[PDB]
């Protein structure tokens, strides 16, 4: 600045958003009108930019809308649009209105999610079906389905091809006795006529996400093969053949108990969400909410578990209370024991009223290690986050030995020299490991045996090792999460 001030001069960059390192990638399909280029990762700013960049009512837009509604600030969003298959078919649903309204009243519908609900008033008694079916003029534009308003029947066609548009169960809440008088003699029938056919199977993850680190991957699809490709890519990010990028993915599986169980495979890189066959809400909307909530919008702390009615509440989703729990308790236990994630209503209320869902257990689809033994090393999702945090933090600590003189053979360090030997290096590392108890590790079972330092000369044979290379082997344990207590209640009629 000029012509002002005494000592200093403050300057601040235009960017009002900070906090990088918390990146979320959302993948889905789009429509024809979208201007965004396909198969190219792009940044997303806010909701005012949507629709134009990703089409009207597209799967990607709906998923992004929930993501922005759950992570108002503190995370950076990215989008990876895809395109429909060459010969994708679009699903068609029918909704026929019959009878003639003979009393004043109102008609209200609930489809897909609370945001798309509508409420219109019947014009007057003696209005036939043709004057009815005005619902088409009321359906919100963002609804992924297109209403045609035919003669007496309204047809809903999916805006995106493939199997994605194959999930609905309407709730026409008002029939029979209703204070908002149900227009007497009016009835509605729901039926499907054509399913989806073909889904895309992109396999070019290595080219478009080649060397960008992402925290959480969100996939708005139910194609098993597509999900498998994402899992394979994540493995490559956790591989030991190159510097790691780390990450985690979220997917959903829908169907009966027999189908859902068969969809799972031993995979610590994914968190599969199980839903029943009659879920009132569109599937991918719930999956996006769970991913966005857990996409470091809350879990900046690597050890925070996304569970319970306090932390695992998907507030952005509203759905009417169902007549039956959907997932019977005998089935809930099996799903949890098999590595799936199960969600349910938060508050108990009379059937037909509105509630919100929450998540019971934050677990990954991991059941066995490479040697085929069973263990829960990577059961909880927090274990994956903590493992990544330990790797990054440990690397930073060891950086201080870069370019430091190291003495072997003769271990006496002359006066004035700046160096170190194996024993001193090991002692310093022990100090760091112990101090982190209660932050990244639990108390070690035996700290004297779970850390080892050996120079490369002691591993390779004579005249084969290199000067100044070490091997560090460490074993640790994540923080404890619970305990079990056996209780023996003992009333005593006698005394002393």
């Amino acid at each position: 600045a000029l012509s002002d001030g005494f000592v200093r001069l403050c300057i601040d960059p235009s960017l009002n958003f900070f906090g990088e390192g918390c990146k979320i990638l959302v993948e889905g399909q789009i429509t024809d009108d979208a201007t965004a280029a396909e198969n190219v990762v792009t940044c997303v700013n806010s909701e005012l930019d949507l629709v134009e960049r990703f089409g009207q009512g597209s799967v990607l837009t709906e998923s992004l809308r929930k993501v922005f509604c759950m992570c108002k600030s503190g995370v950076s969003v990215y989008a990876l649009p895809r395109a429909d298959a060459a010969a994708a078919v679009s699903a068609v649903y029918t909704l026929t209105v019959t009878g003639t309204a003979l009393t004043d009243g109102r008609v209200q519908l609930y489809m897909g999610e609370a945001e798309y609900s509508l409420d219109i008033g019947v014009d007057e008694g003696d209005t036939p079906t043709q004057i009815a079916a005005k619902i088409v003029a009321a359906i919100s534009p963002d609804f992924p389905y297109e209403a045609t308003a035919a003669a007496g029947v309204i047809t809903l066609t999916a805006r995106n091809g493939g199997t994605i548009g194959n999930h609905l169960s309407v709730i026409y809440t008002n029939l029979g006795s209703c204070t908002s008088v149900t227009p007497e003699g009016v009835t509605v029938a729901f039926a499907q006529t054509t399913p989806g056919s073909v889904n895309p199977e992109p396999n070019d993850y290595a080219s478009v996400v080649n060397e960008c680190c992402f925290a959480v991957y969100v996939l708005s699809s139910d194609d098993t093969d597509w999900q498998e490709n994402l899992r394979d890519w994540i493995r490559s990010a956790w591989d030991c053949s190159k510097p790691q990028c780390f990450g985690h993915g979220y997917v959903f599986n829908k169907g009966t108990l027999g189908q859902v169980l068969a969809d799972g495979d031993n995979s610590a890189e994914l968190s599969r969400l199980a839903l029943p066959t009659t879920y009132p809400v569109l599937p991918y909307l719930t999956n996006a909410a769970y991913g966005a909530l857990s996409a470091c919008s809350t879990c900046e702390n690597p050890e925070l578990n996304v569970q319970g009615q306090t932390y695992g509440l998907l507030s952005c989703i509203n759905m009417p209370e169902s007549c039956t729990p959907g997932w019977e308790f005998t089935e809930v236990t099996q799903l949890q024991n098999n590595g799936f994630v199960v969600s349910g209503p938060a508050t108990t209320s009379g059937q037909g009223n509105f509630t919100s869902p929450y998540i019971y257990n934050d677990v990954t689809n991991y059941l066995r290690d490479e040697k085929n033994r069973p263990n829960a090393t990577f059961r909880d999702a927090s274990s994956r986050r903590l493992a990544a945090a330990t790797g990054v933090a440990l690397a930073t600590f060891l950086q201080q030995f870069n370019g430091l003189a190291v003495f072997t053979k003769n271990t006496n360090i002359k006066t004035g020299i700046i160096g170190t030997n194996l024993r001193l290096m090991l002692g310093k590392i022990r100090k760091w490991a112990s101090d982190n108890v209660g932050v990244l590790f639990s108390e070690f079972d035996n700290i004297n045996e779970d850390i080892q330092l050996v120079s490369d000369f002691d591993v390779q044979p004579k005249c084969v090792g290199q000067p100044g290379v070490f091997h560090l082997n460490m074993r640790y344990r994540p923080p404890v999460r619970g305990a079990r207590i056996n209780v023996n209640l003992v009333p005593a009629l006698f005394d002393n």
């Binding site: 001030g5 005494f6 200093r8 403050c10 300057i11 601040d12 235009s14 009002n16 900070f18 507030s315």
Partner: protein, 175 residues
């Protein structure tokens, strides 16, 4: 009636980079000001977003009343604002982060600047727009110094029950 009962509106708000950024050999800095939004047929309008962030800029970029010195100041630049004579909250407008003097080594002077910054931005909590504020400073050497200011907001509609503190008033700006 319809659940949207809160009728309180939001007036103009100063915004960063409203008038662009002024560049120089030393670096690039923003030039805050008012923002104009245009319709499809003219009819320009002012922006009213990021209320709390705009309020913080006003506090930082305004000289407050200077302390008495015994030698005196010219009547033009005594600092402060003449409109503070009417406010009843027992506070004074503006800020005084610019009234520091080189004392001791550079490390000490930077520490004093941070103390003033916390003292002045603390007024945000008193008004009730924000529930907590904190500034982190990092000294790296001769010419590179950085400041970051963190302001905590709240949602417009209450969602949690059993808070140790109190629900900040004037939260209808929801930030």
């Amino acid at each position: 009636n319809f659940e949207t009962a809160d009728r309180r509106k939001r007036f103009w708000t100063t915004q960063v980079a409203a008038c662009g950024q002024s560049s120089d050999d030393c670096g690039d800095c923003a030039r805050p000001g008012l923002q104009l939004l245009c319709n499809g047929e003219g009819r320009i309008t002012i922006a009213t977003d990021n209320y709390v962030a705009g309020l913080a800029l006003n506090i930082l970029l305004t000289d407050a009343s200077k302390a008495d010195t015994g030698c005196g100041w010219t009547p033009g630049n005594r600092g402060g604002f003449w409109g503070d004579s009417f406010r009843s909250d027992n506070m004074r407008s503006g800020s005084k982060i610019r009234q520091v003097t080189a004392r001791g080594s550079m490390r000490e002077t930077v520490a004093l600047i941070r103390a003033y910054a916390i003292d002045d931005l603390k007024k945000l909590v008193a008004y009730g727009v924000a529930k907590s504020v904190d500034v982190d400073l990092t000294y790296q050497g001769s010419n590179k110094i950085d400041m970051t200011i963190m302001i905590q907001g709240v949602d417009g509609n209450e969602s949690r029950v059993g808070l140790t503190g109190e629900r900040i008033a004037n939260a209808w700006v929801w930030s």
